[PDB]
Design a protein around this motif. Structure first.
Motif, short mmCIF file in Angstrom:
data_model
loop_
_atom_site.label_atom_id
_atom_site.label_comp_id
_atom_site.label_asym_id
_atom_site.label_seq_id
_atom_site.Cartn_x
_atom_site.Cartn_y
_atom_site.Cartn_z
N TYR A 35 0.87 -1.23 0.20
CA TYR A 35 0.02 0.04 0.06
C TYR A 35 0.96 1.24 0.15
O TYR A 35 2.02 1.28 0.61
CB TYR A 35 -0.73 0.15 1.21
N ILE A 44 -5.65 5.45 0.72
CA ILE A 44 -4.38 4.43 0.65
C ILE A 44 -4.99 3.89 -0.52
O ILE A 44 -5.93 3.07 -1.01
CB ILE A 44 -4.84 3.39 1.80
N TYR C 56 -17.25 -13.74 0.47
CA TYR C 56 -16.92 -13.12 -0.57
C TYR C 56 -15.45 -13.98 -1.23
O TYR C 56 -14.56 -14.26 -0.61
CB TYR C 56 -16.71 -11.70 -0.72
N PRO C 57 -15.84 -14.36 -2.70
CA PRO C 57 -14.81 -15.11 -3.17
C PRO C 57 -13.58 -14.31 -3.71
O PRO C 57 -12.46 -14.94 -3.78
CB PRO C 57 -15.57 -15.59 -4.24
N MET C 80 -7.15 -11.48 -7.62
CA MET C 80 -5.66 -10.94 -7.35
C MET C 80 -5.12 -12.06 -6.22
O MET C 80 -5.95 -12.51 -5.26
CB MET C 80 -5.51 -9.47 -7.07
N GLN C 81 -3.74 -12.24 -6.02
CA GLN C 81 -3.13 -12.83 -4.98
C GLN C 81 -3.66 -12.65 -3.69
O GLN C 81 -3.86 -13.69 -2.85
CB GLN C 81 -1.66 -12.82 -4.94
N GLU C 82 -4.00 -11.41 -3.06
CA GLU C 82 -4.03 -11.01 -1.67
C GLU C 82 -5.22 -10.27 -1.51
O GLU C 82 -5.90 -9.80 -2.42
CB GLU C 82 -2.79 -9.81 -1.63
N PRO C 83 -5.74 -10.31 -0.27
CA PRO C 83 -6.83 -9.53 0.25
C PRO C 83 -6.52 -8.29 0.39
O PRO C 83 -5.20 -7.95 0.81
CB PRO C 83 -7.41 -10.52 1.37
N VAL C 84 -7.34 -7.25 0.17
CA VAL C 84 -7.16 -6.09 0.25
C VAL C 84 -8.35 -5.49 1.35
O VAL C 84 -9.52 -5.95 1.19
CB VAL C 84 -7.24 -5.30 -1.08
N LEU C 85 -7.81 -4.08 2.09
CA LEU C 85 -8.76 -3.71 2.88
C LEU C 85 -9.97 -2.83 2.48
O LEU C 85 -9.87 -2.16 1.34
CB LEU C 85 -7.96 -2.77 3.90
N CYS C 88 -9.44 1.05 0.66
CA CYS C 88 -8.44 1.29 -0.19
C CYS C 88 -8.79 1.17 -1.57
O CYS C 88 -10.13 0.88 -1.86
CB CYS C 88 -7.33 0.12 0.03
N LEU C 90 -7.44 0.36 -5.72
CA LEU C 90 -6.57 -0.20 -6.69
C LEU C 90 -6.94 0.19 -8.30
O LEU C 90 -7.99 0.44 -8.44
CB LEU C 90 -6.37 -1.56 -6.29
N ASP C 117 -0.87 -6.43 -9.79
CA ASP C 117 -0.65 -7.78 -9.19
C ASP C 117 0.06 -8.37 -10.42
O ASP C 117 -0.36 -8.77 -11.49
CB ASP C 117 -1.84 -8.53 -9.01
#
Lengths: 180, 180, 180, 181, 181, 181
Positions: A35, A44, C56-57, C80-85, C88, C90, C117
């Motif tokens: 981030y 963010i 949530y998938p 995407m590879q990662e969970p995001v808050l 935020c 993107l 990603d």
């Protein structure tokens, strides 16, 4: 009755600065997500997911009302018991400066401890830390952008006094250049 | 076309208040980090990491547009299936008042359930909860600041009607004193 | 020196739009909590905890400066590879449109990948994904509101070109109707 | 070999009593009081803790030890990472924590993981930050309070004393294995 | 003792059939369908679930039980905390959930942990919030849908009926252990 | 049956060498270098990793295999979900990763879970995104650097070559079990 606003500009660096300063966390300890703060909106954003299977070794972020030669605020790595969320801020004491060259450009960063963590608050020099902890940190920055073909050299860490000079200078620089 | 602003002042308490109100979460269920809302910026700050090896038993936060004798908004503990992030808000029904004295000063807090959690929304009195859940909660507040030498006395919980009076009064007080 | 403000209105959709756009995340991958953006304050609220034992998938959210026939921004599911808050934003590339009818009303959503990603950024069509991944996604929307007695029909996914039309049209619609 | 009952069939290790293998019953940050079942050697949920508290570090026991309470000698293990129930690791003792659990003495070992590159170089509990000790002390003082059980905890004693207590518990375990014949 | 195959060598417990030991195969919130391997007694990933769903509670089986499907009697265990695969705990039955898994009857037990201070005082599924039941029902109805397998779930029945089904499955397990001779 | 030492007493499986059972030592995202203890068959913390790195996928070994390094053949297992240490799962090989660990050859298998509905249909490492490979390569290149150990990693080879290496390691394991007589 109050402002509600942009963490770079509208969060005071704090009355203890430069020794103890506020610090806005961008990235949590253990995060593979890089981030960063959007300069324009103060939101963010995901800058990227990291290209290697590495994770940030501590909470990471920036000092509000600072500016460096790169037109960005001064970055901080914050040691403390717990992971902290992106977008929060905390109080941190500088314990050293980590000099770096990121793709041929200077990019020194601060190493610090959270001043309100009852374990970590009593540290004052990075020399007080376990030498492995430094070796790990140093490595992280050497390695984290390798898969993007970005070279990052990391030199030996410099003392608190030196870090404090950098913070102080970046405060001054923010106040000089931010007006226009 | 819209405001974008400070959760204490700019978030309506909600049309169901005082029985059902909006509530800004400062601290997640299971957190050892004591976040709080920065009154000036409306950002979330780390007030501290906790001094004991304890964690918050439920999501915790405050009611916007409330004020108490301590110059702070009224605090809430919110029971619900899931942990919720700092800085989010939710709708909560009051089910009781938890009277406390924090270092010789009154600091009553609300105990509540999330009104949009399909399990917890049908609770209306804390008496409906399992007695252990109360004993646990009561204990948490007795114990959480012990390692800071701060004494916190917790009395028997009072009913929904009483909680609603406190919320109502803190709404009134916010509107009286916030102007100046 | 900068705005600090509302993610729907004040976050640019981005110069790559409609093919690559900014996207504000409301809900993390694996979350049972259905966060949504509060239109008035721009805060994140808990709309509800989900009524089924489903999660949530992928990261889920909306595109700023879009508007649909429902008076809401256009929604996106981001692989995407990662969970995001929550809260935020993107950068995301559209790879398909997921047509739906939510309680007899049209509610098409975008399926996309994070453009930053390094694994997922090279996808361009949902046909490139493993067929199970689609079957899973399709199922999630069929099933997630079942315990609220809300029927949601999901049709076969349509190609990138079609998704891009929807985004483009929702940009246009935002600019037409948001002024008044 | 065949599968091992961890208490009995896991060697305490070559470096004992100073450096010993150690079976983890409970992860750092857990509210579940796992313990190892004496009879089956499986992991059991003894109980969920009565307070909103969590174990400040990975917790478990030293194999082939025994105390007057008829249980193995317990250990708290400081290290960078949380560890799973059922796993064992190598640990150096750096102090002993005297306690009284409802009138009964129930001393535990404070230790570090010997294979953790940060923590392995600690050798005395005095080398740790004083707050770390304050927090651990309080954890044991407080974690059983909602079960109406009193636990008193006294000043921590040096590694020389810890090593003695470990040795003494290896003797008791042995003394018991002899009384099997 | 030696190491235990959990199905066979873990006692069902003194309070059976009302209160029984119970081996956890799957954690609350897991998408991994772990189950215990019949032959090795290790934990196996049977599969990753086909839908974006998760187990609403800790899930497993009662040892030394057997059903017409040739597997032990399954249990869902309500409690404050998630629990690891491979662990066992003490559980009271508070209802039974009748199901039909592709024409075959596959009833499961709904239970609480008996050592969890919050949940231990529940004795009937009717004491739980109706939504909790609605959610559990739906989970079993939906979790195998993307494998094209139908699962029908009927109204939950009281603890008296659960206890019978448990008893009956202890009988079958025994009846089978006799047919070993 | 009785409890199983996973290396020896867990069958490699009917579909070997192409599709094999596989014991997980380390979870995706872990910094703890667990490995299975040769003697006890328990899980041990070999060490906490020296760099701020994590295993990019679930990691472990194939039972009843052996290599010149005296250890079983190692596997990296791509799948939707993280899996616990001590569990086994079914895996198809889709490539082999040649490495040199301090002058010694230490090739590993890259694989997918065969019971994971997304990942099961992959059959070649070339079907994966090139970045996935770049990341894995780098992980092994970098994870031991702070221990001053060099690890070189060469271009990944096809599944035909992987299957050979697996077969060859089943032969060595067998050849060793014969040398027990």
């Amino acid at each position: 009755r109050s402002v509600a606003a942009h963490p770079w500009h509208d969060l005071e660096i704090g009355p203890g600065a430069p020794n103890i300063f506020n610090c806005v966390v961008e990235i949590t300890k253990g995060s593979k997500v890089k981030y960063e703060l959007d300069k324009k909106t103060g939101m963010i954003k995901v800058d990227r997911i990291l290209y290697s299977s590495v994770v940030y070794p501590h909470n990471y972020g920036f000092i509000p009302r600072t500016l460096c030669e790169d037109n960005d605020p001064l970055d901080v790595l914050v040691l403390m018991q717990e992971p902290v969320l992106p977008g929060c801020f905390l109080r941190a004491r500088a314990i050293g400066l980590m000099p770096m060259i990121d793709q041929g450009e200077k990019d020194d960063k601060i190493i610090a401890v959270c001043a309100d963590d009852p374990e970590y608050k009593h540290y004052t020099d990075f020399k007080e830390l376990q030498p492995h902890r430094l070796m790990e940190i140093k490595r992280f920055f050497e390695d984290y952008k390798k898969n993007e073909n970005k070279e990052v050299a990391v030199n030996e860490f410099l003392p608190p006094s030196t870090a404090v000079e950098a913070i102080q200078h970046s405060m001054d620089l923010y106040a000089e250049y931010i007006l226009h």
